[PDB]
Amino acid sequence: LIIKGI
Amino acid sequence: LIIKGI
Amino acid sequence: LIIKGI
Amino acid sequence: LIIKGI
Amino acid sequence: LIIKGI
Amino acid sequence: LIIKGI
Amino acid sequence: LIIKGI
Amino acid sequence: LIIKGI
Amino acid sequence: LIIKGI
Amino acid sequence: LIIKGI
Amino acid sequence: LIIKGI
Amino acid sequence: LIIKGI
């Protein structure tokens, strides 16, 4: 799982 | 961005 | 599953 | 963009 | 399944 | 755009 | 452009 | 499957 | 551009 | 799978 | 750019 | 998996 913001 | 696998 | 924003 | 598989 | 916005 | 398969 | 095969 | 924009 | 295979 | 932006 | 394999 | 920004 990868979660990337700004 | 979300990338999800097993 | 890929979920991509702006 | 949403791309979903199994 | 592919769902593509603007 | 929606593209759906099995 | 969309090109779809199997 | 190929999906091409502008 | 989206290119998807197996 | 290749997804290419601007 | 996203490139995903196995 | 490769994810490339600006």
From Swiss-Prot, chains A, B, C, D, E, F, G, H, I, J, K, L:
Disulfide-bond pairs as recorded: none
Tissue/organ expression: Ubiquitously expressed. In particular, expression is high in pancreas, placenta, lung, genital tract and spleen.
Post-translational note: Hyperphosphorylated in hippocampus, neocortex, and spinal cord from individuals affected with ALS and FTLDU. Phosphorylated upon cellular stress. Ubiquitinated in hippocampus, neocortex, and spinal cord from individuals affected with ALS and FTLDU.
Domain of life: Eukaryota
Compartments where found: Nucleus; Cytoplasm; Cytoplasm, Stress granule; Mitochondrion
Disease per record: Amyotrophic lateral sclerosis 10: A neurodegenerative disorder affecting upper motor neurons in the brain and lower motor neurons in the brain stem and spinal cord, resulting in fatal paralysis. Sensory abnormalities are absent. The pathologic hallmarks of the disease include pallor of the corticospinal tract due to loss of motor neurons, presence of ubiquitin-positive inclusions within surviving motor neurons, and deposition of pathologic aggregates. The etiology of amyotrophic lateral sclerosis is likely to be multifactorial, involving both genetic and environmental factors.
Subunit (UniProt): Homodimer. Homooligomer (via its N-terminal domain). Interacts with BRDT. Binds specifically to pyrimidine-rich motifs of TAR DNA and to single stranded TG repeated sequences. Binds to RNA, specifically to UG repeated sequences with a minimum of six contiguous repeats. Interacts with ATXN2; the interaction is RNA-dependent. Interacts with MATR3. Interacts with UBQLN2. Interacts with HNRNPA2B1. Interacts with ZNF106. Interacts with CNOT7/CAF1. Interacts with CRY2.
Physiological role: RNA-binding protein that is involved in various steps of RNA biogenesis and processing. Preferentially binds, via its two RNA recognition motifs RRM1 and RRM2, to GU-repeats on RNA molecules predominantly localized within long introns and in the 3'UTR of mRNAs. In turn, regulates the splicing of many non-coding and protein-coding RNAs including proteins involved in neuronal survival, as well as mRNAs that encode proteins relevant for neurodegenerative diseases. Plays a role in maintaining mitochondrial homeostasis by regulating the processing of mitochondrial transcripts.
Record remark on domains: Consists of an N-terminal domain (NTD) and two tandem RNA recognition motifs, RRM1 and RRM2, followed by a C-terminal glycine-rich region. Contains a nuclear localization sequence and is mostly nuclear; however, its nuclear export sequence permits it to transport mRNAs to the cytoplasm and even to synapses as part of neuronal granules.
Name of this chain's protein: TAR DNA-binding protein 43
Lineage, opening ranks: Eukaryota, Metazoa, Chordata, Craniata, Vertebrata
Full protein segment contained here: 248 to 253 of 414
